[PDB]
Design a protein around this ligand. Structure first.
Ligand SMILES: *[C@@H]1O[C@H](CO)[C@@H](O)[C@H](O)[C@H]1NC(C)=O
Ligand SMILES: [Zn+2]
Ligand SMILES: [Zn+2]
Ligand SMILES: [Zn+2]
Lengths: 213, 239, 267
């Protein structure tokens, strides 16, 4: 099997930067190499076929080069809509193989999240479980710390975070943290608090509520 | 251009079988349809890259398989229906993922002229389907409970209010969420599902709407979880 | 007057080649079930009524002339030449002409089609620097539909022009249906060109060319061809008719007006 190794594994860059992705083959594959782009939740799309040919309809800022074992995909001026994963793929010989992919990420100005908290609904408690949700909206960079506090006691091991893919239009992220505990435990305590720390905030932001208010 | 659409995906136990289908429509140069082309199956495990599985030539010959599925999977096609099939048997947990069918660009046969390329080119995949999700698990399907995430007074941050739907405890993937039947899309975020310790998925969808809207307008979230034939429309209102 | 025959063609002294299921033209082009006849020679080629074609359906304008001149040449010696066909796909084949289990084509012809999204104007030359005549066999594909035409050749109308320094033939393909034969309503037409020593072949096409792979060496001599269903026996006779061999001790004969060798005169 011919192995394709892509670098870097992951890259952050600013709008307008000239970006270079590399694909290395373990053996001479001549020019039988194609590059694809895949956006989150979508199927791949051909960008470059046979090492250097730009597919019909693909923007001209994309170009391809190389031969033998060494190939490059170049984006002359990175756009926010370019976020996603790029794969190289080889068809010199069966089995056909793909590179492990390179993920592209946009850098933009800092933007502080707006924070909201939601208590468990009445329908859900009626069924023995309590979910408390914290939402961080439209922020950058992705790194954020979300800390749960129950009756002012620092919580751990009972929450899960999920993060959206970087937005194709404004390059921000959104995040949700869900604190899950049994109805019994939820009814024990009174004050529920989500405390958020982030580079765009001068100091930690806290959102809270009192159970049954 | 030719377009592809896979179907047949679903949840199955390890050891069981499953047949995926892929239907071609549209047409390319010279009104060529899918039966003029070689086609491959390619899959993508959750969070992973792409793995080529199998190729078949326009006329049904020159078949090959990756070692990882050779002897278990069988590729075939019915050109009268412009349809491709992948018959999977003896499925295992690590076969879980999204399966795509994908057309190779070089013309391989023209039936009306009795012509066939001497060689199988197998060049670039110029058209891909949307993919079909396959889950191989011992666990049984379970449909989601849908709960409102209700906006409250003092919840304002920026100049906006937030509300949402919590879609909890379902298996397998995936569930779709829209708002007001797709009429509301600005400011919608649907988060990736997270696997809970229970082995079931949970997901949230939220939307930010001007604070003035709350009592005045209506906000409804529509959740689909085809695997259990679940279709819920839950109304989100202030507490 | 010799009025009788044994009913058998004697295999001596003349070299008889029994065509069995093949006509001479099918042997020339390289119909797969006929490739046994590759590079063969004969004094007399014998065509059987049971012969049949089993490759891409074709016709030969002036069939009678090509058949006659090859039969007279008495050999199928073929010499491959290194034609270069830049920017097209070679070795097209068909399930109308299987060679073993897969699709195939006449062995002596080369079905060219587009490469990628184009079929350029082909323009190739092959000089004759030998001291014998070369016979080139080439062809033209006539598609049954416009969809077919463009799928194969890109150009909406093709053209094949083959010339030497003093002759030229230009053929324009004709799109449309002919009667269905072995599943196919399209056709190939076969043409030929002789190139003398010091002359040169030029082939210029922007579609529908079925290219030659090389040439047949032309000879002159006593060779010919005959239609007959008589079996071929081990025995000796100078005179051969389609009815069988006949003695040539008598000055006249009444067996058949078609004869080969030292034969009495037909009356
Ligand atoms: C075809 O090739 C010949 C020989 O090289 C040359 O004389 C002639 O100019 C060429 N014709 C075209 C159309 O290029
Ligand atoms: Zn292997
Ligand atoms: Zn407490
Ligand atoms: Zn938002």
């Amino acid at each position: 099997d011919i192995q394709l190794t892509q670098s870097p594994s992951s890259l952050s860059a600013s709008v307008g930067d000239r970006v270079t992705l590399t694909c290395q083959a373990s053996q001479d594959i001549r020019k039988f190499l194609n590059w694809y782009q895949q956006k989150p939740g979508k199927g791949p799309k051909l960008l470059i076929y046979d090492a250097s040919n730009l597919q019909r309809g693909v923007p001209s800022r994309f170009s391809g080069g190389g031969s033998g074992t060494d190939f490059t995909l170049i984006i002359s001026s990175l756009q926010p809509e370019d976020v996603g994963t790029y794969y190289c793929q080889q068809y010199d010989g069966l089995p056909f193989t793909f590179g492990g992919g390179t993920k592209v990420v946009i850098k933009r100005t800092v933007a502080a999240p707006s924070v909201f908290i939601f208590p468990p609904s009445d329908e859900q408690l009626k069924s023995g479980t309590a979910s408390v949700v914290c939402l961080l909206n439209n922020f950058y960079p992705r790194e954020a710390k979300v800390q749960w506090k129950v009756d002012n006691a620092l919580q751990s091991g009972n929450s899960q975070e999920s993060v959206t893919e970087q937005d194709s239009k404004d390059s921000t992220y959104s995040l949700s943290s869900t604190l899950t505990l049994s109805k019994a435990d939820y009814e024990k305590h009174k004050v529920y608090a989500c405390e958020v720390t982030h580079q765009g905030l001068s100091s930690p932001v806290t959102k809270s509520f009192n159970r049954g208010e | 251009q030719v377009q592809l659409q896979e179907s047949g995906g679903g949840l199955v136990q390890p050891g069981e079988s499953l047949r995926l289908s892929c239907v071609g429509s549209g047409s390319s140069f010279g009104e060529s349809t899918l039966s003029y082309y070689a086609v491959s199956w390619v899959r993508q495990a959750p969070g992973k890259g792409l793995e080529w599985l199998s190729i078949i030539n326009a006329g049904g010959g020159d078949i090959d398989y990756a070692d990882s599925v050779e002897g278990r999977f069988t590729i075939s096609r019915d050109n009268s229906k412009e349809t491709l099939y992948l018959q999977m048997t003896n499925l295992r947990v690590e076969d879980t993922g999204v399966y795509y069918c994908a057309k190779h660009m070089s013309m391989q046969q023209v039936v009306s002229a009795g012509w066939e390329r001497a060689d199988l080119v197998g060049d670039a995949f110029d058209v891909w389907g949307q993919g079909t999700m396959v889950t191989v698990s011992s666990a049984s399907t379970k449909g989601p409970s849908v709960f409102p995430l209700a906006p409250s007074s003092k919840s304002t941050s920026g100049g906006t209010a937030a509300l949402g739907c919590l879609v909890k405890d379902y298996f397998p993937e995936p569930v779709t969420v829209s708002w007001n039947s797709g009429a509301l899309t600005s400011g919608v975020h649907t988060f990736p599902a997270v696997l809970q310790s229970s082995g079931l998925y949970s997901l949230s969808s939220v939307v930010t709407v001007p604070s003035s809207s709350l009592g005045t307008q209506t906000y409804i979230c529509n959740v689909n979880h085809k695997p259990s034939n679940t279709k819920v429309d839950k109304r989100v209102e202030p507490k | 007057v010799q009025s009788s025959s044994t009913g058998k063609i004697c295999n001596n002294p003349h070299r008889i080649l029994d065509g069995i299921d093949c006509t001479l033209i099918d042997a020339l082009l390289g119909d797969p079930h006929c490739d046994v006849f590759q590079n063969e020679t004969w004094d007399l080629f014998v065509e059987r009524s049971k012969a049949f074609s089993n490759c891409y359906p074709y016709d030969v304008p002036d069939y009678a002339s090509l058949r006659s001149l090859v039969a007279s040449s008495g050999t199928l010696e073929f010499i491959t030449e290194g034609f270069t066909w830049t920017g097209v796909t070679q070795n097209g084949g068909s399930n109308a002409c299987k060679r073993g289990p897969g699709s195939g084509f006449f062995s002596r012809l080369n079905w060219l089609t587009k490469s990628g999204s184009t079929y350029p104007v082909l323009n190739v030359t092959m000089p004759n620097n030998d001291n014998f005549d070369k016979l080139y066999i080439w062809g033209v594909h006539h598609p049954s539909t416009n969809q077919e035409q463009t799928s194969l050749y890109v150009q909406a109308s093709g053209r094949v022009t083959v010339s030497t320094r003093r002759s030229q033939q230009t053929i324009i393909p004709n799109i449309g249906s002919r009667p269905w034969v072995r599943g196919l309503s399209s056709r190939i037409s076969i043409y030929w060109t002789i190139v003398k020593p010091g002359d040169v072949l030029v082939i210029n096409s922007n579609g529908n060319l079925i290219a030659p792979r090389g040439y047949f060496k032309m000879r002159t001599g006593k060779s010919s061809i005959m239609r007959s269903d008589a079996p071929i026996d081990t025995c000796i006779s100078e005179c051969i008719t389609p009815n069988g061999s006949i003695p040539n001790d008598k000055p006249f004969q009444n067996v058949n007006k078609i004869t080969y060798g030292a034969c009495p005169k037909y009356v």
